[PDB]
Design a protein around this ligand. Structure first.
Ligand SMILES: OC[C@H]1O[C@@H](Sc2cccc(Cl)c2)[C@H](O)[C@@H](n2cc(-c3cc(F)c(F)c(F)c3)nn2)[C@H]1O
Ligand SMILES: [Cl-]
Ligand SMILES: [Cl-]
Ligand SMILES: [Cl-]
Ligand SMILES: [Cl-]
Length: 138
């Protein structure tokens, strides 16, 4: 379906009520996936499933400013499975990105990058077959 890494333009950046939906399948023996909501070279929101970080599965979220990664936000819930189809929904709310996987809420990430309308690309990378990536306003 789509070539990874895939770039989805976000025209005029993001705004509350914007919903991004990603459909794909995790490859066998996946190691990593990443979503990168980019403001130029900066990464406003990096969402990064790691399948084998010291034999644990964890989602790492962070922001990259002037080429430097900030303080990571980790929680324990890991809804992805090697080999299986998934849906990721990222809903922009006024104070955070809200993420649900497979229709179940996963996590929130508070806005560190304040200029939402300059967050103008979403990169999708890692160990998936990517079916589709799109957005709508709810
Ligand atoms: O905090 C989050 C960051 O963690 C560092 S490690 C680190 C080093 C120094 C300081 C800090 Cl705070 C962290 C990683 O190197 C970063 N990273 C992952 C990817 C990547 C690329 C791909 F192509 C993928 F497919 C993929 F899934 C992921 N690109 N950059 C990022 O995850
Ligand atoms: Cl493509
Ligand atoms: Cl951008
Ligand atoms: Cl804005
Ligand atoms: Cl990739």
């Amino acid at each position: 379906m789509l070539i990874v890494p895939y770039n989805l333009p976000l025209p005029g950046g993001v705004v509350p009520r914007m919903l991004i939906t990603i459909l794909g399948t995790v490859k066998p023996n996946a190691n990593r996936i990443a979503l990168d909501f980019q403001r130029g070279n900066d990464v406003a929101f990096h969402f990064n499933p790691r399948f084998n970080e010291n034999n644990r599965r964890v989602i790492v979220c962070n922001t990259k400013l002037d080429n430097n990664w900030g303080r990571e936000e980790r929680q324990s819930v890991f809804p992805f499975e090697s080999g299986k189809p998934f849906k990721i929904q990222v809903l922009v709310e006024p104070d955070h990105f809200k993420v649900a996987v497979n229709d179940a809420h996963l996590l929130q990430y508070n806005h560190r990058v304040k200029k939402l309308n300059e967050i103008s690309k979403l990169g999708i990378s890692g160990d998936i077959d990517l079916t589709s990536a799109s957005y709508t306003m709810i």
